[PDB]
């Protein structure tokens, strides 16, 4: 129990399930958006040369 107030973290059971959903989309998301500049930048890189 001084080990779980040492961590302080609530890690309440709808917390963690909602916690890991939203901050594994944000993975997901933030994994498309670099994909879409890297086709842009390539598509860029195309123009110039």
Same mark, same amino acid.
């Given at each position: /129990? &001084? %080990?779980?107030?040492?961590?302080? =973290? &609530? #890690?309440?059971? $709808?917390?963690?399930? !909602? #916690? +890991?959903? +939203? +901050?594994? !989309? /944000?993975? %997901?998301? /933030?994994? =498309?958006?670099?994909?879409? =500049? $890297? &086709? /842009?930048?390539? &598509?860029? #890189?195309?123009? %110039? #040369?």
């Amino acid at each position: /129990l &001084q %080990e779980m107030k040492d961590i302080g =973290v &609530q #890690a309440d059971a $709808n917390a963690e399930m !909602r #916690a +890991r959903e +939203r +901050r594994d !989309r /944000l993975h %997901e998301a /933030l994994s =498309v958006n670099r994909s879409r =500049v $890297n &086709q /842009l930048e390539k &598509q860029i #890189a195309f123009c %110039e #040369a």
